[PDB]
Amino acid sequence: KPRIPVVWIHGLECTCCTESFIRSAHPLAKDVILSLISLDYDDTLMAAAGTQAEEVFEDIITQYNGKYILAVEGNPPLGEQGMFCISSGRPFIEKLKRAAAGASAIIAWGTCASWGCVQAARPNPTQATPIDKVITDKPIIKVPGCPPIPDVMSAIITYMVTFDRLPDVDRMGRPLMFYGQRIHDKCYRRAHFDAGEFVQSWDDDAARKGYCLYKMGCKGPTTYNACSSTRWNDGVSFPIQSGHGCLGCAENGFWDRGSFYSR
Amino acid sequence: KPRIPVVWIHGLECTCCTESFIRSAHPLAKDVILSLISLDYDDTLMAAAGTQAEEVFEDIITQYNGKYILAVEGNPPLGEQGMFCISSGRPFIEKLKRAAAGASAIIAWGTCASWGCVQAARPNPTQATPIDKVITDKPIIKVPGCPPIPDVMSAIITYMVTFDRLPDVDRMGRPLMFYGQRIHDKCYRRAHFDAGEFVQSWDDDAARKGYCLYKMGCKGPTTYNACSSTRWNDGVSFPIQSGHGCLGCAENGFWDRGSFYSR
Amino acid sequence: STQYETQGYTINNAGRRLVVDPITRIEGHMRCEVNINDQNVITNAVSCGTMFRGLEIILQGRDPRDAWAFVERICGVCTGVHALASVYAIEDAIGIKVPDNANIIRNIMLATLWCHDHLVHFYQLAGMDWIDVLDALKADPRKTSELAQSLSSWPKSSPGYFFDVQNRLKKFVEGGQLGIFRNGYWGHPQYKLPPEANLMGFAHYLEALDFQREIVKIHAVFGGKNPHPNWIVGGMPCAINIDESGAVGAVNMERLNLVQSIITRTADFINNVMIPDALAIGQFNKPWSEIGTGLSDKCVLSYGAFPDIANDFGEKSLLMPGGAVINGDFNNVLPVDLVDPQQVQEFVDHAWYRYPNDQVGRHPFDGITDPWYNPGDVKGSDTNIQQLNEQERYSWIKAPRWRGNAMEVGPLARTLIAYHKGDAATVESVDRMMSALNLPLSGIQSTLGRILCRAHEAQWAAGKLQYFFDKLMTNLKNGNLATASTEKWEPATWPTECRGVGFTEAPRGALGHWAAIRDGKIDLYQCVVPTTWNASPRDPKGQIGAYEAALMNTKMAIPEQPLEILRTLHSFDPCLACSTH
Amino acid sequence: STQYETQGYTINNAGRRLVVDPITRIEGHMRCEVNINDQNVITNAVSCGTMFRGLEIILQGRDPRDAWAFVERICGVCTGVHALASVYAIEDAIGIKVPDNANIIRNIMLATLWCHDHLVHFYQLAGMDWIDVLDALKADPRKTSELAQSLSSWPKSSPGYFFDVQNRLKKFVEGGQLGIFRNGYWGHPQYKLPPEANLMGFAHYLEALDFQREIVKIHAVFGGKNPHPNWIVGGMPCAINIDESGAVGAVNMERLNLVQSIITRTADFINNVMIPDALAIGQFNKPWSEIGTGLSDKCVLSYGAFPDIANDFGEKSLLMPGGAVINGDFNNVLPVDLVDPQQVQEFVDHAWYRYPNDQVGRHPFDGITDPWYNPGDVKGSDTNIQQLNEQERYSWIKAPRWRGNAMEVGPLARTLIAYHKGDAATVESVDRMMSALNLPLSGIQSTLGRILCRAHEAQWAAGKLQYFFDKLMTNLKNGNLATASTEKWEPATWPTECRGVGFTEAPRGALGHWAAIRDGKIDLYQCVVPTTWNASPRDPKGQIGAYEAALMNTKMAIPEQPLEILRTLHSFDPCLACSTH
Numbered sequence A, B: 001k002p003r004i005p006v007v008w009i010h011g012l013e014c015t016c017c018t019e020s021f022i023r024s025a026h027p028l029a030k031d032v033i034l035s036l037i038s039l040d041y042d043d044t045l046m047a048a049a050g051t052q053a054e055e056v057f058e059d060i061i062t063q064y065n066g067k068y069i070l071a072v073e074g075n076p077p078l079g080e081q082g083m084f085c086i087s088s089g090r091p092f093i094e095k096l097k098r099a100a101a102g103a104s105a106i107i108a109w110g111t112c113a114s115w116g117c118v119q120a121a122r123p124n125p126t127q128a129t130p131i132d133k134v135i136t137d138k139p140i141i142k143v144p145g146c147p148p149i150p151d152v153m154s155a156i157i158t159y160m161v162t163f164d165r166l167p168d169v170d171r172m173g174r175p176l177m178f179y180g181q182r183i184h185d186k187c188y189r190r191a192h193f194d195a196g197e198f199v200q201s202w203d204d205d206a207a208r209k210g211y212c213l214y215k216m217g218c219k220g221p222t223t224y225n226a227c228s229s230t231r232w233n234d235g236v237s238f239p240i241q242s243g244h245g246c247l248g249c250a251e252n253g254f255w256d257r258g259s260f261y262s263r
Numbered sequence C, D: 001s002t003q004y005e006t007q008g009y010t011i012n013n014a015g016r017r018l019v020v021d022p023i024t025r026i027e028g029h030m031r032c033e034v035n036i037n038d039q040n041v042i043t044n045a046v047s048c049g050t051m052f053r054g055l056e057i058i059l060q061g062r063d064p065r066d067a068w069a070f071v072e073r074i075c076g077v078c079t080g081v082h083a084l085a086s087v088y089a090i091e092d093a094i095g096i097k098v099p100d101n102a103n104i105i106r107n108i109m110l111a112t113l114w115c116h117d118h119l120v121h122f123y124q125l126a127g128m129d130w131i132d133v134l135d136a137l138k139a140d141p142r143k144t145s146e147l148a149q150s151l152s153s154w155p156k157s158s159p160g161y162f163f164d165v166q167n168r169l170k171k172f173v174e175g176g177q178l179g180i181f182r183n184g185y186w187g188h189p190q191y192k193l194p195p196e197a198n199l200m201g202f203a204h205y206l207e208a209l210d211f212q213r214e215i216v217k218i219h220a221v222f223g224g225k226n227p228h229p230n231w232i233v234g235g236m237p238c239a240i241n242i243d244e245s246g247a248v249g250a251v252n253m254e255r256l257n258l259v260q261s262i263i264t265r266t267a268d269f270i271n272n273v274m275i276p277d278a279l280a281i282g283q284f285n286k287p288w289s290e291i292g293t294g295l296s297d298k299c300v301l302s303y304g305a306f307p308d309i310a311n312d313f314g315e316k317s318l319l320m321p322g323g324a325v326i327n328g329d330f331n332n333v334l335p336v337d338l339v340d341p342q343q344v345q346e347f348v349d350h351a352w353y354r355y356p357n358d359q360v361g362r363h364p365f366d367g368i369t370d371p372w373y374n375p376g377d378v379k380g381s382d383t384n385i386q387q388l389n390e391q392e393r394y395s396w397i398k399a400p401r402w403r404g405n406a407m408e409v410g411p412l413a414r415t416l417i418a419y420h421k422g423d424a425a426t427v428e429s430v431d432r433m434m435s436a437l438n439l440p441l442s443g444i445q446s447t448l449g450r451i452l453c454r455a456h457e458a459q460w461a462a463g464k465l466q467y468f469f470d471k472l473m474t475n476l477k478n479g480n481l482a483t484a485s486t487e488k489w490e491p492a493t494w495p496t497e498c499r500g501v502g503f504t505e506a507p508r509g510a511l512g513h514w515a516a517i518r519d520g521k522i523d524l525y526q527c528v529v530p531t532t533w534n535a536s537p538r539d540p541k542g543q544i545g546a547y548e549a550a551l552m553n554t555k556m557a558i559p560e561q562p563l564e565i566l567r568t569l570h571s572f573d574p575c576l577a578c579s580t581h
């Protein structure tokens, strides 16, 4: 039976979201690609380049018009007429608009596509802009994080394929399943927070006992993600578990909320 | 290079501690057996039976007198002159005492060897007795839990081999590394406890959001183990994460501290 | 010395007495004695459970809702099966019906156990009876590769791989620290595999030791941990949330994806490693198709298991059939009723327990667990058993009978019941498997047969895991998430007095828990467990149980080395902590 | 049209122009243009970075302690390396020395990245340039097994496995949804593997895609997560506790055990899958040992990496050597000094930036990042480029030079430097490798050689992982637990004005971060990154960078199909987000 077409494009990005996706432990990214979706366009992985890649793009968005999921990694820059990000000699934004027009739904992978991420931090030299400020007539599912959790990315895909539906979202377009609660609402160091048991300097006695990282700048109290429950890399760890406070990396504007080490 | 000899005996038991040990993810139990120790006697796994197994036992404890680790799973019953647990036609306690006499150190695996576990729960029909009430002249490391966490068991072995010393212990003989803090001190649902956000009946809305299990009888507040941090089965879950309160299974006498569903 | 006749056997305790104590590569504590005649053939066999804990006594006065946690610790090998039987029994007594997803998940829990338990038994417990590990050191790695590739598509078959495995074994043994291989039976004439088959087998031993740890991740997801996962009366505690806020706190899509990944890998390992290995053991050990028949051509018993219609334990619901055959009449599979006082009864005339009348058998609702260590004259002392006295009390295991008949339970029993009830999948599987071995159907009724059936059951269960998972996902797609019924959670809702039976098919055979509740507490809790049946001592008629019968008439090549005894006992997968509880 | 001479090349932009935009199977955005003559030989090559974000501008005014987190997001492929260079630069500026365990753990983080990144590059990025995926459908599974087994001890080699992989590909393509394989170059005459080698390589593609996810578990333990782990100025935040209360909250024995498990598996996969595959590509594609030499026989550059003596960045400490070769004189490995204003300089006369004088280069402590999109007289327009004008500004990438020389960086460069400095392990590895191919040492200076050296380096880094792990455990055994120095954590302790350099060898080559701190804040932060070197545009002398040089003089079988261009560009492992930052 045919697999659901997916077109995966890249704007200004670091490719962390693609890298996260291929970490997926269950389903393996191999099995996602071979059996769950048809990953029909993806600059990072596809054989074809140049004119052959353009032909793929055009053929897929035409033949599957109205029927493909568009995944977006990165974002369009509005500065310099868009030519801070060039694809096939033209502004990336033109490719984004063409792809968006034919999509049934759009997944904004990562804080880049969702909000802006590091290139949109002050003073935003390129006028990097999140997808939903450019594409205003299509469903956009925001999957933020820098990058999002690998098994969250693949669970979202499996949900869409298995249940033949978009995930229900909060008021910001994030899937409720993984972004309904805060890091700090499911953090295993909460006992320490509640008792006023804090790391005060790196590698102090508190740190060696896994005390709370709030006084070291942890932004888990204002960050919605699944890191303290699902965790990272097949459940091996997450930022706090390995001794660094949450940076807030799933939240809009987290780069410009002050030092990561301050309150 | 010779591997440290280990003699693993079994009293009254359910074999959950052997089963836990073989679940080890890192190091694999295979690699523990082939590379880290010499598992020289172990009823559950050894080729020899009967007189051949007696010969192995006698040879190992004689040849390596003073130089083997004795692992004990289960416990000795004092009822019926010890014949509630018979080995080679004699009370198990005789084999315990013979093995203990030649050991350099003893590991008391599980709540059985540490405290008594289920057979010692009221009214303790067999007078099941923990190892440290019988053997009083040897180092005993208590590794409680019903059973203890697989990767905790292997971590304790690796520590003893790698560092050539016993783990430092609390006042009850439990390794500080894994038993120094309570379940509730590192529980990811502590946020809910602090907020008075509790499951009140199974599969209520609170349960479906992962609220705290205190009102469902969770004994995490009085239980020392690593389940809420190291977790179980290669980090996949632990009792509370899958929706059941902690039973208290690492603590002396936990079976007789009231219903698992009461305070 | 005496002789008497029972069940077609001549029980004769003349001749040399051999003792095997401890029995190893089982769970828990067993002693076996035999007598052999001048032809080194067994003419008497004595099965003895050498442990007792008393869970039936400990369970008195407990809250019924807590019972499953206590009885789960009957056994850490068949971990979970006693919890399942317990929640079934308490639900039966109170009148509780669980939601469909709870039932499906319970079936997943049980199938997972079947897969795990049967795999570890094949390799770690029984395997070294058939594989000469030391002989693997003589194997040619390329011939080993050739053999493996002839039998299976399994990827791990390179000559280099087999050389690496062999070299690891060589380095392990070189210093004299043979560990679990110390003082084994290696070189015994009944070891019939060629060296290449031994190296293949040993490699798979190691692969299985690694892979088994993954299977139980399914128990970790739904049950918190393995060994000894958690359960509730009224369903399961693993609340589901797929598409709502807080799914991070519940069984969500990522958790279900993990389960699916484990299922696929479990099926692939069993189908491409365990199944070919079991067939290879058959090919090289065909004479063991005629050894250790015991009661398997006379009397076999299954209660049935895996209700596919939630809360329906009838014949149309159970995916694993129940029934009983007696007197060798496989054309009349008889229905089993666990409430009928004339059906299941336990005797203690040959066990270390007190009854007011030890000449009668007690149904479990009338059960008594009053320990009485009384070995009589054992050629030593009460604390030094040199020879059990099988004319009197010789075991901590009670003697169950079905309508007074001594029965065999377990994979072979179940296979025979389903085959003769006309289960299509079973008939086709068995016929094909015996065809491939060029053996008659009767060759299944044997020590070899028990091993073949166990492997085929692991395959069956890995298939059912996927069916059950798909059934769960179908409900979730339809918005049916319920996992617990709590209408009758509070004791104030229970009958003042009620009783119930929980039953299933554990990896080793038919399991029942009989519970009586009064005034909110357990008044009576009696267990009859598969190894209780199989390892049973004698009854007032002198009838022998499955182990004693299967050992009867067996040739030993070398009396002092009990390899044949071990082979047959291990083929039943003894769990002695289960048997005695 | 124009023609000029530089570095032994004739740069001639007469004749047919070919454009490859987008370059795929790279990180980020690149455009390449070439001119070809009537003989289908490239006579001109143009390297263009088609993205810019401006991290050097974004970092101004930030707290130096936060810088690592920002610059880590330069790149998610080489994830972590920018964080390492950042903490190095800030520690160099402020005068901070970290504890030994922090240094060892950082060395582990870097070796982990080398292994992971090199593995994924080999299979997922470059692999399909060498492996004809659709041709794998024609292989014989048994001949594929025999080939694999002849090259490696790797277990997964059964005929049944190769058949199963082949059938998976067959199913994948059967519905006409070829996905990442659609409209590829399959069947091009430059595909030289036999069908069996294609099937072996494709099976390995899949195995590598699975296995890479495991490697980065090391990053998760010490750094919280991958991609983009966490770090601190002063050491690492992963406090250690082996034997004290609350070890559950720290790097403890169980966490270290997990790390060891991953190291061993990583070494095994690289040594028994990646290495033999690299050699096999070599064996079947020997002509590519004479294609794509570029600058690799003239000028190569390494800063060096992996300081084994904590806080000592000298030659006696760095385990991966540093040095520079120019003018093809490999007898003269020159020392590199990243503070010397006459050594590393960047030019922008051919890039989209403003300088006060674009005819001179600026050392990074005098760096300027003032973006100016000015493509000038293109064919087309500024928002619709048909042809870049390489006589003026044509890239978002600055042009780095070393003492005015255009250099190649990366695994080949490092291999040459280490070889010619007399590193015993490098000499032995290279000699053994080239001996197995029956090729001269000069054969490494080539497109094929870049792939061979990358595979070599993955094996090297895997061995170093074990070395570093053992060193960490040695310290812990001695009671040396410290992971952070915090005496200069607070800004008031810093010099009011200071500057520092942080350098290392990223997977793709020499990396440097130059930071100036004033009044507690980043005053300047300039990055020069390995792909900035290799993908460099021209300078005022018209000197070409490593990509443009390596593409010069290349034959194309089919002008419309850029297989040869892709092969050579992919051999350098382009990271365009890195290059531009």
Ligand code: SF4
Binding pocket: A183, A184, A187, A188, A189, A190, A191, A193, A211, A212, A213, A214, A218, A219, A220, A221, A240, A245, A246
């Ligand atoms: S470490 Fe961060 S998320 Fe966890 S309890 Fe402390 S402040 Fe909250």
Ligand code: SF4
Binding pocket: B183, B184, B185, B187, B188, B189, B190, B191, B193, B211, B212, B213, B214, B218, B219, B220, B221, B240, B245, B246
């Ligand atoms: S679930 Fe148990 S351990 Fe966790 S916070 Fe609640 S009471 Fe404490």
Ligand code: FCO
Binding pocket: C075, C078, C081, C082, C506, C507, C508, C509, C511, C529, C530, C531, C532, C574, C575, C578, C579
């Ligand atoms: N299987 C199993 Fe254990 C036994 N006998 C139970 O029930």
Ligand code: FCO
Binding pocket: D075, D078, D081, D082, D506, D507, D508, D509, D511, D529, D530, D531, D532, D575, D578, D579
């Ligand atoms: N490797 C790598 Fe990325 C590049 N170029 C960096 O630094």
Ligand code: SF3
Binding pocket: A013, A014, A015, A016, A017, A018, A073, A074, A109, A110, A111, A112, A113, A117, A118, A145, A146, A147, A148, D073, D076
């Ligand atoms: Fe994930 S491409 Fe990496 S920067 Fe933050 S999401 Fe973007």
Ligand code: SF3
Binding pocket: B013, B014, B015, B016, B017, B018, B073, B074, B109, B110, B111, B112, B113, B117, B118, B145, B146, B147, B148, C073, C076
């Ligand atoms: Fe672990 S053998 Fe199982 S009962 Fe509780 S520890 Fe004992």
Ligand code: F3S
Binding pocket: A145, A146, A183, A223, A224, A225, A227, A228, A238, A239, A240, A245, A246, A247, A248, A249, A250, D225
């Ligand atoms: S930094 Fe990001 S990865 Fe999770 S713990 Fe905080 S949202």
Ligand code: F3S
Binding pocket: B145, B146, B183, B223, B224, B225, B227, B228, B238, B239, B240, B245, B246, B247, B248, B249, B250, C225
């Ligand atoms: S029941 Fe036991 S397994 Fe851990 S969570 Fe509680 S100590």
Ligand SMILES: [Cl-]
Binding pocket: A008, A009, A010, A011, A043, A087, A095
């Ligand atoms: Cl794109």
Ligand SMILES: [Cl-]
Binding pocket: A111, A115, A116, A117, A118, A120, A251, A252, A253, A254, A255
């Ligand atoms: Cl943002």
Ligand SMILES: [Cl-]
Binding pocket: B008, B009, B010, B011, B043, B087, B095
């Ligand atoms: Cl023992």
Ligand SMILES: [Cl-]
Binding pocket: B111, B115, B116, B117, B118, B120, B251, B252, B253, B254, B255
């Ligand atoms: Cl206890």
Ligand SMILES: [Mg+2]
Binding pocket: C056, C398, C526, C527, C528, C529, C581
């Ligand atoms: Mg009973």
Ligand SMILES: [Mg+2]
Binding pocket: D056, D398, D526, D527, D528, D529, D581
């Ligand atoms: Mg720069």
Ligand code: NI
Binding pocket: C027, C074, C075, C076, C077, C078, C079, C575, C576, C577, C578
């Ligand atoms: Ni059991």
Ligand code: NI
Binding pocket: D027, D074, D075, D076, D077, D078, D079, D575, D576, D577, D578
């Ligand atoms: Ni990069």
